[PDB]
Structure formats: structure tokens, C-alpha cells
Amino acid sequence: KTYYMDPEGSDSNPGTSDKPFATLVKVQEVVVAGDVVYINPGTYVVPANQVPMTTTNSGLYHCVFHMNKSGEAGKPISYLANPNKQGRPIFDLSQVKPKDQRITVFYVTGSNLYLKGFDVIGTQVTITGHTQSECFRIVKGANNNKFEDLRTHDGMAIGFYLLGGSNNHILNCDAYNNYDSVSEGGKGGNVDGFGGHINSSSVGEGKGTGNVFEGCRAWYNSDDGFDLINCFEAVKIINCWSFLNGYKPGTKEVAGDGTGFKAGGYGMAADKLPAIPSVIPQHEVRNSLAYYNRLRGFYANHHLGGIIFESNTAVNSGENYNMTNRESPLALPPTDVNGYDHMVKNNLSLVTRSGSKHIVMVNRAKSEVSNNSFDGSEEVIETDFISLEEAELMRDRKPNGDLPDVNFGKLTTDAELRFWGMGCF
């Protein structure tokens, strides 16, 4: 019941400790509910000519791994970095460059799956126009899953991209240094760290609800860190950090929208009314940190209703809090109005950077806006913080995947009294 795989392994082997597998394709040929797969640490380079497991959207996508099989309730399938060995499994996909096809590395339709402790790097984009690739894409039917301590970095693909599925828990994952340098002149406008976009086909309790990002970090993603546009059920972002998004990796060169948390929206299309859910979901961002994104930190992103921004810290992220909503009902032309039905509470905002701002575009008559540092009588300053050394945010996680201890953006005990019960620490 416990299978093994290894970069110096063979798919002709039975998949034991002494003689392990070599690819997840063979793994998907055997597994059933309850079984474990220990993925031994090292670099697995996916061959250039490895046939896809499936395709979607009429051959628009090469799907490298179809995570199609399911566990049962209390009996999951578990794909796990081998916990008896140091280091991490790394799937390299630099070589996978199929002709005129988008790439999904993990395409998830199965339920009760548990994926932990490995990396996906080098995911390609070869298409020239409006395109994207994804490391993980999750759709209608993929329920009750867990993705933990998975790192999606140093490629061109979106980290995690949700079009459907229920109660998926994305825990302690990192999505960084991702940038599409090939398509549309290298804008990188489609490459987010984390993307919650539960489509019209996947609504209903048990079908699109209860998806949560938690403990995740998103940095140097060319577009946004986290994005919940075109999201029909409520997604929650808890205890996450989004920083240095909107830039080409390792620089302050302009790429995409550079939002830390784009926590709603259905677009401001001038030509047509966008499709929307009948109940506008109250998304939540909570106990989360935004720092030095290109343009904005915590952003309602033209949402058609309420959002919770509770107990977040925001530092030098352009517009740190922006609550801009689209007017209701849907109307052309698309007109922006002061944010309505929001819960904005217990947040902290440091602005020392040229052009940045504490809050914009909220209606205090129509939203609950209480106990935020930017509304207090005393302005927040650099001395109030124990550290502001940004390299501490890129510290390697604890051995069990939890976010590392950081002094960054944490108040001093003196400052904690003058800003009490404010911020994500």
C-alpha cells in the first residue's frame, strides 16, 4: 500500500523501497483509496516527448499529470515527499514544450487527495497570444483535497489556479519567481501565485464552497500574488503573505498588475456585461501580510458586493487598502463606486514609500470600517516595527511546512499598546 518513486528509478519495477517507480503516470496506473506514494527527493526531469495523460478544452491544454483517481472519506490517496530522506522532490518541466498547447502540470479532478512536500519548476509557455500555463489546475468535481508544502517556482505558469471544486485546502504552499517572458511581449499579465476563479459551472454547497488558501506565500509573480476575480463562490485567504508581485523576478522592472491580494471583481469590461453568480460571494482576507507589491496591497478589485479584510498588515504596497467596487446592478458603461457591504477591521498600514497610501474608496455608511491604524489619531512609523528587513519573508519554512518566525512587520510591545489588536501579528 505504500509505493515509492525515484529519479534513478524504473516504471518496470514493482514500486517498492528496494526497487521503486520513476513517473507519476505509472503511479496513477495502480493507486486506490488509502494508499500512500513516497516520492524520493531529487530532480525529476519530465521528458520533452512524454505524452500527456489527458487534454482539456478541445486540445488547448497538454496535461502532464491527470490527478483523476479519488480516495474516500477517511481514506485518502497521499502523494508525499519521502519523510525518511533529506531534501525535496522537484519536477522540472523546462523540456515540455508541446506545439501550440497550454500546459497544466497537475490537472486535478479526483477527490480526497493529499499532495505534500515537493516542487514544480520550469513550467513553460510557448503560445504567443493570450495564454497561460498552470502547475496545479483544479476544476468542478475535485472535492475535499489537500495541497501542502508544495512550492511552484522559477517557471512561466500560474502556481495554483482554481476553476471549481469544493473544500480544497491549499496549505503552506509557496508560489514565486513565476513569469511568462514569451507571450504578448513578456507583459506577464496572466501569471499569478494563487488564483481563485470558481466558474459558473461549479456553484453550490459541496461543489464550489469552502476552498481556502492558508499559510501560503506569493512573491515575484509577474501579475498578482493572490487573485479572486471571476469567483462565484467565496474563497478565503488566511495567514498568507503576498509581496513583490507586479515585477519581473529579482528586479523592480514593470510587468503585470502588482496586486498583493485582488480579492474579488468581475471585470470592468466596457463592451459587455460579465457573467456573475446570483449571490455575490463575500470573500475574506485575514491575518495576511502585503508588502511592496507594484501597485496595491489589499484590493476589492471592482467587486459587486462585500468582502472581509480583518487583521491584515500592509507595508509599502502602493494603495495598501483599496475598496473600489463596481456599481450594482451590473451596468454599461462600467462605473466604479466607494466600496459597499465590507468588513474592514483591525488592520495595520505603514506608508513610507513614494506614492503609497493607507486606504481608498470605501463607503463608511455602507461598510463596517472599525479599528484600523490608518483611522487612529497617531500616524504609524518605521520605529514602531521590530524589523522591516524584507529578506526575512523569504526565510525557509519550518521543517513541518509552517511559515518561519519573522520580526518583519511585527509591532514592538510599546507600539502594540498604541495600535491594540491591529495587524496580522
Ligand X SMILES: C[C@@H]1O[C@H](O[C@@H]2[C@H](O)[C@@H](O)[C@H](O)O[C@@H]2C(=O)O)[C@H](O[C@H]2OC(C(=O)O)=C[C@H](O)[C@H]2O)[C@H](O)[C@H]1O
Ligand Y SMILES: C[C@@H]1O[C@@H](O[C@@H]2[C@H](O)[C@@H](O)[C@@H](O[C@@H]3[C@H](O)[C@@H](O)[C@H](C)O[C@H]3O)O[C@@H]2C(=O)O)[C@H](O)[C@H](O)[C@H]1O
Residues 183 to 202: which contact ligand X by CB under 6 A? 189
Q: Which is nearer to ligand Y, 77 or 125 (CB)?
A: 125
Minimum CB–partner distance for residue 418 and ligand Y (Å):
40
Q: Does 234 bind ligand X (CB under 6 A)?
A: no
Query: Cis omega (within 30 of 0) on the bond before 329?
Result: yes
CA distances from 417 to 384, 387, 408 (A): 11, 17, 18
Number of residues binding to ligand Y, judged by CB under 6 A: 10
Residue 302 touches which member of Ca ion, ligand X, ligand Y, none, C-beta under 5-8 Å by kind: ligand X
Binding-site member from 267, 286, 338, 375 for ligand X (CB under 6 A): 267
Q: Which is nearer to ligand Y, 197 or 357 (CB)?
A: 197
Binding-site member from 85, 169, 197, 418 for ligand Y (CB under 6 A): 197
Binding-site member from 189, 208, 215, 249 for Ca ion (CB under 5 A): 189
Residue nearest ligand Y, CB atom distance: 190
Q: Which is nearer to Ca ion, 9 or 195 (CB)?
A: 195
Residue nearest ligand X, CB atom distance: 268
Residue 295 touches which member of ligand X, Ca ion, ligand Y, none, C-beta under 5-8 Å by kind: ligand X
Residues 108 to 167: which contact ligand Y by CB under 6 A? 130, 132
Residue 132 touches which member of ligand X, ligand Y, Ca ion, none, C-beta under 5-8 Å by kind: ligand Y
Of the ranges 209-217, 225-233, 246-254, 318-326, which one interacts with ligand Y (CB under 6 A)?
A: 225-233
Half-sphere exposure of 172 (CA within 13 A, CB side): 16
Residues 2 to 61: which contact ligand Y by CB under 6 A? 57, 60
What x/- string results for residues 244 through 263 when contact with ligand X is judged by CB under 6 A?
Answer: -------------x----x-
What x/- string results for residues 90 through 129 when contact with ligand X is judged by CB under 6 A?
Answer: ----------------------------------------
Q: Does 180 bind Ca ion (CB under 5 A)?
A: no
Minimum CB–partner distance for residue 408 and ligand Y (Å):
29
Minimum CB–partner distance for residue 375 and ligand Y (Å):
32
Residue 145 touches which member of ligand Y, Ca ion, ligand X, none, C-beta under 5-8 Å by kind: none
Instruction: Quickly count: other Cβ atoms within 10 Å of residue 250's Cβ.
Output: 9
Binding site for ligand X (CB under 6 A): 189, 223-224, 227, 229, 257, 262, 265, 267-268, 295, 301-302
Binding site for ligand Y (CB under 6 A): 57, 60, 130, 132, 190, 195, 197, 227, 229-230
